[PDB]
Design an enzyme around this catalytic site. Structure first.
Site, mmCIF file in Angstrom:
data_model
loop_
_atom_site.group_PDB
_atom_site.id
_atom_site.type_symbol
_atom_site.label_atom_id
_atom_site.label_comp_id
_atom_site.label_asym_id
_atom_site.label_seq_id
_atom_site.Cartn_x
_atom_site.Cartn_y
_atom_site.Cartn_z
ATOM 1 N N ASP A 61 -14.425 -35.908 34.797
ATOM 2 C CA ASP A 61 -13.804 -37.258 34.078
ATOM 3 C C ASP A 61 -14.585 -38.277 34.529
ATOM 4 O O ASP A 61 -14.510 -38.602 35.974
ATOM 5 C CB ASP A 61 -12.275 -37.381 34.357
ATOM 6 C CG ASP A 61 -11.768 -38.531 33.541
ATOM 7 O OD1 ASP A 61 -12.212 -39.425 33.196
ATOM 8 O OD2 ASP A 61 -10.755 -38.277 32.603
ATOM 9 N N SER A 104 -10.143 -42.081 27.936
ATOM 10 C CA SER A 104 -10.082 -40.651 28.107
ATOM 11 C C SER A 104 -9.245 -39.949 27.016
ATOM 12 O O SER A 104 -9.493 -38.727 26.793
ATOM 13 C CB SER A 104 -9.106 -40.249 29.581
ATOM 14 O OG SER A 104 -9.920 -40.657 30.734
ATOM 15 N N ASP A 114 -1.625 -36.028 32.156
ATOM 16 C CA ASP A 114 -2.650 -37.069 31.861
ATOM 17 C C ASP A 114 -3.795 -36.522 30.689
ATOM 18 O O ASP A 114 -3.698 -35.579 30.214
ATOM 19 C CB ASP A 114 -3.611 -36.973 33.020
ATOM 20 C CG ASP A 114 -4.509 -38.219 33.079
ATOM 21 O OD1 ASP A 114 -4.084 -39.486 32.409
ATOM 22 O OD2 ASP A 114 -5.651 -38.175 33.609
ATOM 23 N N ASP A 131 -13.085 -40.095 37.991
ATOM 24 C CA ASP A 131 -12.904 -41.273 37.185
ATOM 25 C C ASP A 131 -11.955 -42.142 38.064
ATOM 26 O O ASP A 131 -12.076 -43.257 38.233
ATOM 27 C CB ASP A 131 -12.409 -40.791 35.867
ATOM 28 C CG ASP A 131 -11.581 -41.895 35.363
ATOM 29 O OD1 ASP A 131 -10.331 -41.860 35.492
ATOM 30 O OD2 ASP A 131 -12.286 -42.347 34.379
ATOM 31 N N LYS A 132 -10.886 -41.507 38.580
ATOM 32 C CA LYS A 132 -9.896 -42.285 39.317
ATOM 33 C C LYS A 132 -10.336 -42.954 40.267
ATOM 34 O O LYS A 132 -9.887 -44.416 40.638
ATOM 35 C CB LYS A 132 -8.542 -41.465 39.722
ATOM 36 C CG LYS A 132 -8.006 -40.679 38.254
ATOM 37 C CD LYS A 132 -6.703 -39.637 38.642
ATOM 38 C CE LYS A 132 -6.607 -38.757 37.473
ATOM 39 N NZ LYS A 132 -6.084 -39.583 36.226
ATOM 40 N N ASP A 170 -16.142 -36.731 30.004
ATOM 41 C CA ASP A 170 -15.526 -37.486 28.752
ATOM 42 C C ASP A 170 -16.186 -39.096 28.445
ATOM 43 O O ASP A 170 -16.340 -39.251 27.344
ATOM 44 C CB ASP A 170 -14.027 -37.663 28.804
ATOM 45 C CG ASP A 170 -13.642 -38.305 30.021
ATOM 46 O OD1 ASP A 170 -14.393 -38.632 31.199
ATOM 47 O OD2 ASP A 170 -12.479 -38.749 30.284
ATOM 48 N N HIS A 171 -16.804 -39.676 29.429
ATOM 49 C CA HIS A 171 -17.463 -40.712 29.257
ATOM 50 C C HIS A 171 -17.982 -41.170 30.525
ATOM 51 O O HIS A 171 -17.590 -40.695 31.733
ATOM 52 C CB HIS A 171 -16.339 -41.878 28.832
ATOM 53 C CG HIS A 171 -15.168 -42.111 29.815
ATOM 54 N ND1 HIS A 171 -15.242 -42.555 31.022
ATOM 55 C CD2 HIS A 171 -13.905 -41.448 29.782
ATOM 56 C CE1 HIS A 171 -14.084 -42.461 31.661
ATOM 57 N NE2 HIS A 171 -13.369 -41.809 30.987
ATOM 58 N N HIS A 187 -14.916 -48.415 32.509
ATOM 59 C CA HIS A 187 -15.706 -47.371 31.857
ATOM 60 C C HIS A 187 -16.842 -47.948 31.345
ATOM 61 O O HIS A 187 -16.946 -49.082 31.129
ATOM 62 C CB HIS A 187 -15.082 -46.450 30.710
ATOM 63 C CG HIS A 187 -13.740 -45.786 31.077
ATOM 64 N ND1 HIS A 187 -13.016 -45.117 30.172
ATOM 65 C CD2 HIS A 187 -13.321 -45.590 32.275
ATOM 66 C CE1 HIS A 187 -11.831 -44.729 30.732
ATOM 67 N NE2 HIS A 187 -11.971 -44.900 32.107
HETATM 68 MG MG LIG Z 1 -8.825 -37.125 32.762
HETATM 69 ZN ZN LIG Z 2 -11.566 -40.517 31.474
HETATM 70 ZN ZN LIG Z 3 -11.117 -43.693 33.703
#
Ligand SMILES: [Mg+2]
Ligand SMILES: [Zn+2]
Ligand SMILES: [Zn+2]
Ligand SMILES: [Mg+2]
Ligand SMILES: [Zn+2]
Ligand SMILES: [Zn+2]
Lengths: 441, 441
Positions: free
Chosen positions: B43, B94, B145, B319-320, B361-362, B404
């Site tokens: 992620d 996401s 999530d 990501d987090k 995902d991005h 993002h």
């Molecule tokens: Mg995720």
């Molecule tokens: Zn994401």
């Molecule tokens: Zn994010």
């Protein structure tokens, strides 16, 4: 075609693929030697720069007819070295990265054509010329700038454009100290068949020693048999380029003017200023050739050589506009590189024996961020080809110039030996890839 | 192996290639169908995240034995749509991005398993299961999530974790109003053979209607035959997973604990504070399975099905921790993901009929910038595997969370149908590729 195929609101509508690619990719894999290699460099053109320019000019689901149409793709690394210790420096400059792909050796930031011990290494242009291939060096920057200079010059600092600075900053390279000379002196010795770009300014300096001492570097080039052109009409009128009569194009005193103009990005610019439409640079004249014109003319003149040719083409001001936090300047120079890539691919598809490679020396600052972002750096909202708003952000420097970034980035290729850019590679692999494709010992 | 081949200060010493790859890639182009598909999602793991983690943990000339080992590489676009207009939104979230690769349709930011008209589309996991394949869904995030949820739930907002919030934010999906239910209720209806991750908290909520009205979702899951496990020992003790006995791993209340800790990046952090060494998370008990251990056990159990399986694995907290401008947390979860990719590739190489894909995902905020940068956002200096200092920078948000970014980013693959990730593709192409690979209709 790799545009979105249908209605992007419906299932499948945003696919770029029409079906399975295995057989087409299989056919794209050619092991035979290359007769010609065309390397196109977007200075600072990381994946973010490509993506922003596509979104603006072609739409999110659009397709760059040049940049996006090369079928074999990978990611490569461009870290440089600390000069004193030899350990990695994770963010290169233009000189060390160009050295990497022109010689196959890593080096320190600012070095051109030398390693961390200041030892010169042969470039791909020098090797191709030694084998009797025709050679070309095209850029929209001053010809003394790092990216074109690396092919022809070996100096301890990229600042050593002409005799005057070389004497002060690269004293072991200075001609009056027995060195090979300034970048411009070394260009004129290297004698590519075709050299096109900016940087006329340094050609008015005078040599301090040697056979052409006292003469301006322009006078030296004239006396040594270079044909000099200075605008689009005279470039178009050239019909041959050879070692007997090498073509030198000096189209501006400094860098040649970028195509597009817009406001600089600003603090909370995406919020407190309306979205931007890029406009033409008023300094941009039609007397000045475009990157596509010089690429097509270079290919024309170099392809008369029966043994083949090596050509490097730089879209140089993507990086310089990214430094100045100008999305319109940066995007316009990316559109400009795409038109040159189109010229190279059009030639390479009909020829059948040409490796075309499109990549960047290093990544840069600009980021695509949400339209409602509140960012600490400079931002700007842009009206895109989709009819939507895109926000670009420059968030890595409080000083006048935005910084390069260290991220790995896209390298793409078409033709014989193109398989060697797929997967993770290094920038120094690119040198070996072009050496092997052209069968150079 | 794609590590630098030698002494990086010498000619050729930083090359990642030992010879021409044309013949090796041709052999990597496999046309037969895949029996199994393993998709691994980092992620937020754009090319910058990959590079920073490699620099830190493997060295600039190092090589991720999982992430960097997949031979067929491309770049793909992940823009979402504006819900009202249907035009591109250049920076996805996401939920929309996961919907894109699990259903093949673009949608709006926040949507799960539905389009911009709020209508549901079938997912690759639902289609796999309907065709008879075993199915698995593994994540270090809460199972509610966006990334794991998209495989099993169709809701107008990703916030709709359990009944309580669904009734308020997604009333058309709420069970008691005739919808298919909250994300957790839809997961239990979806019934993968193997679901492992966090998010035990929502299983304490009680259903408002249906056959299991008045029971907690944990009680419902027991009543429906799920085998619930809660730590590494109980996970490793499970011997089978099937539609009669689906395995449900709930290893944390919310997200699974990250592997590494470090201080948050800070203003001028690279100037005013010393370089940082990441340390393992002291709050992470040894009884918590790692991503690699969940991955290997999922494959072990899913591979018993003779017809084949589909498995998605997410390293969720890259990501987090990117959001929180925490380089150590971010890099740790990338290293974590690399170990799980190794498990998938080791299985795939001996199986011979498994497509493995690794992507994101991005893209995200973090950038690698020069050590002496003075940046407006949050920065941090890190001691790397090379013994050199890296600086990472979070410069795109003044808010509590970093944004993002919209850049295209790497997708890489191994095995049958892997050629369909080469070149420029779209995230919705990934759905079609996975579907075609598994011969799904
Ligand atoms: Mg995720
Ligand atoms: Zn994401
Ligand atoms: Zn994010
Ligand atoms: Mg340059
Ligand atoms: Zn550069
Ligand atoms: Zn630059």
């Amino acid at each position: 075609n790799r545009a979105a195929q249908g209605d992007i609101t419906t299932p499948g509508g945003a696919r770029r693929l029409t079906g399975d690619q295995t057989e087409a990719l299989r056919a794209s894999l050619i092991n035979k030697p290359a007769k010609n290699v065309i390397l196109l460099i977007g200075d600072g053109m990381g994946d973010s720069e490509i993506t922003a320019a596509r979104n603006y000019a072609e739409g999110a689901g659009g397709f760059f007819k040049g940049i996006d149409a090369l079928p074999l793709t990978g990611q490569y690394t461009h870290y440089s070295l600390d000069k004193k210790t030899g350990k990695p420096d994770y963010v290169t400059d233009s000189a060390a990265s160009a050295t990497a792909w022109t010689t196959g050796v890593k080096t320190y930031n600012g070095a051109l054509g030398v390693d961390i011990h200041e030892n010169a290494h042969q470039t791909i242009l020098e090797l191709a010329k030694a084998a009797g291939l025709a050679t070309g060096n095209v850029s929209t920057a001053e010809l003394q700038d790092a990216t074109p200079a690396a092919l022809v010059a070996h100096v301890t600092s990229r600042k050593c454009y002409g005799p005057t600075v070389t004497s002060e900053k690269c004293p072991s390279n200075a001609l009056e100290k027995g060195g090979k000379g300034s970048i411009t002196e070394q260009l004129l010795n290297a004698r590519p068949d075709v050299t096109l770009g900016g940087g006329a300014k340094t050609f008015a300096e005078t040599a301090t020693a040697g056979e052409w001492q006292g003469k301006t570097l322009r006078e030296q080039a004239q006396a040594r048999g270079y044909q000099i052109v200075t605008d689009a009409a005279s470039l178009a009128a050239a019909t041959e380029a050879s070692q007997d009569k090498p073509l030198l194009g000096l189209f501006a005193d400094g860098n040649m003017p970028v195509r597009w103009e817009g406001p600089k990005a600003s603090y909370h610019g995406n919020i407190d200023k309306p979205p931007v439409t890029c406009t033409p640079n008023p300094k941009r004249d039609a007397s000045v050739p475009t990157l596509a014109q010089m690429t097509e003319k270079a290919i024309d003149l170099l392809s008369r050589n029966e043994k083949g040719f090596f050509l490097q083409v730089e879209g140089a001001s993507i990086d310089k506009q990214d430094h100045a936090a100008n999305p319109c300047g940066q995007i316009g120079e990316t559109v400009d590189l795409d038109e040159a890539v189109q010229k190279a691919l059009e030639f390479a598809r009909k020829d059948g024996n040409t490796l075309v490679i499109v990549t960047a020396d290093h990544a840069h600052a600009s980021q695509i961020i949400p339209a409602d972002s509140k960012a600490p750096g400079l931002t700007q909202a842009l009206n895109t080809h989709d009819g939507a708003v895109m926000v670009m952000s420059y968030g890595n420097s409080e000083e006048e110039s935005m910084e390069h970034t260290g991220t790995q980035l896209r390298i793409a290729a078409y033709g014989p030996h193109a398989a060697n850019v797929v997967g993770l590679t290094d920038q120094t692999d690119l040198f070996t890839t072009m050496k092997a494709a052209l069968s150079l010992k």
